[PDB]
Ligand binder design. Structure first.
Ligand SMILES: [Zn+2]
Ligand SMILES: [Zn+2]
Lengths: 129, 129, 132, 129, 131, 129, 131, 132, 132, 130, 131, 127
């Protein structure tokens, strides 16, 4: 594969291992709607010049009712992690650190949905303000 | 463009809005290494028989030693969502809820990495032991 | 004297986190609890003798599932909404502080966890019911 | 058993579904000392012109050595709810959501109290300082 | 010299601690009284496993105070030192969010330990060996 | 040899979350604080008159860069490690309780956040400065 | 309704069993094949005097399998069922020491019956009528 | 066509203590469990294809506490009693052995421990109900 | 000295599991045994003169089957119960430990086995009587 | 002859039939050294207010090395029960149940004796140290 | 490692013991002094049928303890080692229920063996040939 | 034949008598794979300074399939003891206490084997 990396930016995170993969994203300049939406997970062992793609993740950009359903939502990915972390808890791999993480993630979901429910009490959902 | 659901199971979570998208993964009977690894997010309004794919997210199955880098990690999806929310915090649409969610997700990474740092006191990281 | 009722079968809810400086909270005795919980509470003043309760306020909770018994009283979420509302007002005053913001956060997280339980009991169709 | 709503404001909160009950407080114009003090829980299935009172809850208004003990503290209501949830934990309705909420309420009490304690070190509690 | 023999002492290792310039040691688990370690050493990490090059000694209270009297520090004392220093670091050019989050965690740690103490006071068992 | 020293410029650390039932905690004068912080502390008996401090223990923190003044104190991380070790030992005894469990989760999360500051100054390559 | 004549069925009574709600019956001892009862019924205990009210029928293997096939269940299959259910109750609000002790006793039952099979297999007589 | 029935949601009870040489045991899917337990069991012939069951027997356990839902399935102590009876038969015959003796003792102690609970709860007047 | 009785025909109960460090246990002479068992026990201080018993406690077990003779003493289950109660109280104290936990489980199982005997004698109607 | 129950607490267990006898001890309020020490076996057939004492049983209160010898020890009672049941075995009433009980009772003694031995190595036997 | 003739050595096949990698062998039964085997070998089970491939030799006391003094180990020493190792495992990631159960069983085995000792010491005849 | 105690630790349990033999093992620090693996049985009256070996026992270190077969298993020792005790029960020294011990040791073997078969079902065996 080995596609080129010029526009892309490597999302580096001190809490992220970066041992076997890297995460890459669109240039800040190309960010649409205030945020990044086209991400690549690629193998770490590559020239800076190139990215070896393992996986592409694209998020919904533009409101759903104007542009259609053209990508995922943050909630969806979190669900996957939870589902899998709950599968790990229901295995020999059960540990405290996983239940801690599952709890944090559900509370994430909750906080985000609070934002939804509050923008719904005011009436306004997916609004320009 | 629709694809057959077949073995795939809808991952439904009460905490997830699930308005315009749905998440699926391989049947539980098909899971390798205790966990689902092949998720598909698809449009909600669809045939219950069919899945309308929007994105396919596939996770690493197996020890990298003997199976290679064949998938994404939970840490990578979460890096994506942390980055997007941090972007949203540079915007008109900064809010407390996002701040809380970023703090939750960061704490979720910390717990996972504690698992890993404890496996790295014992040198058994990236392995199946 | 006309503001006193006897303690009787009432219990003092004592919690080590609660100051009891001016008030004491009472509830009905355990034997009388119905539906697995205390539903009848009294806040009274601290400086009366233990034989009596000097009631400031009576808060009575919903006793029994609604589907069968209707609306007897308040729900935990209602009292928590009251307290959040006041704390947020204090935040929006000269007396804004960090401890109030923390307590607002904790109370909201509490509403969220109670909500997750309710949402799950809705998917199932068991909300408002005695079914577990 | 109706009463006129009148000046009373309805407490609408994205986190509070209002399925069965509606909380009202005193008109914002009538709030003494920066906060509402006189709440009504009424039946939700009622028209805006009326409140169907299920319960009245009145909070400590004014300084105590000036107007007397004339209502309840936040701590007291939180204590009731902690008591009930703990009682539910000791029943077939025990669950992890209840446990999480109980933990949250106790940490709420801890934070509110810090304030009192900190001020007490500075000599000033029961007072306005 | 400046080194003393490791001997009975056990290195305390935690993945979450960097352990770069220091090492934490306790008395040997076989020698713990009252169910815990109470005699800790912080020593130079770049010494040699057979020795301990001691930087600081920290001794905790061994035995309930209402039975044995005051003879060492409480957890609460050390945590308060850390909270103090972190708050200083917040009131400086190096104010940051991570320090903020650690202060919040440490204060919640104090509040939990406190509830226990408070409940025990109601029950009359504070400072005692009772459960 | 009264086990008693003069208070002097030392300041008393009075924090509302500390009872001072048995011990008082002191530190160097704010004026002698170096590098924005207190690095020399004393734990002393409470009953002692204010003019004096009765020492029980002394704690001293790394003061200045290890590079030019050497190793001359402890880290915060070290005292938190001691406390976590003790509380986990207590959880393995008739004295197990839920408050200890919480306290440990808090202290672990505290270590994780401090770790995150350092991991960030590493991915930023300005660590130790 | 849902009744069957009691007929030749014997009732199994052991003091260890209460019989408050259910009663257990098997075929008359004269009719036992292979030294053992094989056909059991559980019936409602509050039943008319002539009858059995069958809640469930469980029939066990008649014969060595190798000679006659699989005719039925084995003791191990029921004990497994019971261990599965009790463990589930433990992951429930109803967890008790008593259930735990039982699951331990049932697992040890399973281990003992197991030794016999393994020992017999070394001797090549499992599935046989040989002693 | 020897009685093969689709497996479906059924879960194979795969326990390290059961050989699976002749028979397999299946319960209903975890997702389906009521009252916190599996209640609908099948014993199937083991030498079969993993998407099918060749049922030898069906065993239905009491769903719901008896005083609330009535008598609608077997109890654990019932199955234990059957096994004890058959092993005591085996002991009075050429096939007597220590292993059977041991196993009988184990199962009697099992019944005794489950009994304590029933008795304790009977002293509490909560046996047969859904009270903890 | 004070509080002594003569050693008399009393037999010492010497059991290799009992350390005799502070106390000794005696019973009536084997030849004075009514109903196949010793009924009259004495705990005495272990450090008394040779010809003497220094009693700390006397314990008299029920002589004669219950239904035919009445009630004249205590039963084994009563002592076992005392011991279980004290060991539980100890587990609920700073002295909690695994060896107590084990012991309590043994004592309870002891009671259960004696109970099985009682329930089987009652399935025969012969409880408290001399019929085998 | 009866006595007032008063503070005394009935000790009731599911495992005790209470058919003929009842067991009482002092109010938990009054327990010294974290345990009941003053037990009374009375007759079952009596009103809740009154007790019909068949036997008093006093247990050692406080570590022996610090308060002296003042009551029985759990081990003494267990020994009595073992002795009687063994005798029953040398009788026509020999049963498996009694035998298994002796094993349970002997094993109980063995666990209690572990603690004592371990405490002896520690030098804390019959002292109040943990 | 290396081989030794199989010869008179008897394999110890017990059904509960897996023999996956290792076998256990002992002297021939006619060579048993004092009613019992005393010389045991643990060999690799993966070697030619005529050979034994030692990993470990174990020689138990042969002789009257009182008369011949010390000639080898006692069953109690091995059980003490195994208990120690299982406790170690319990203080590690390897903690599980099965280990706790086997530690309990082994301690009770030692307590039964020790009962025998204490009784032959109430009768004065320990370590001697007297029945 | 005396080797000094050195690193070795003395294993003492209230349950074991220590009258004639003493069990020693490697120091905690040298423990590999979280457990002791090298044991020495030695004479009791020997000085604390030294150990007089009577036998040496080396338990399998590391995963059997990665580091080879280099020690004995618990299973193997317990089988030796069961075997001797069963010999004793076939002799005039037959007694109930040995029979109890044989039963305890067999249930021991059953619980360890359950750990194994539970790795086999769960597929994680020997790692
Ligand atoms: Zn939190
Ligand atoms: Zn047992």
């Amino acid at each position: 594969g080995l596609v080129p990396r010029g526009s892309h930016m490597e999302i580096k995170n001190g809490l992220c291992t970066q041992k076997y993969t890297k995460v890459y994203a669109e240039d800040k300049e190309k960010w649409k709607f205030n945020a990044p939406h086209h991400f690549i997970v690629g193998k770490a062992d590559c020239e800076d010049e190139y990215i070896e793609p393992i996986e592409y993740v694209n998020f919904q950009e533009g409101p759903i009712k104007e542009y259609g359903i053209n990508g995922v939502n943050n909630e969806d990915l979190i669900l996957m992690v939870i589902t899998r972390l709950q599968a790990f808890q229901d295995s020999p791999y059960k540990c405290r650190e996983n239940a801690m993480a599952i709890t944090k993630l559900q509370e994430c979901l909750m906080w985000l949905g609070k934002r939804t429910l509050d923008r719904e009490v005011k009436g306004i959902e997916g609004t320009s303000e």
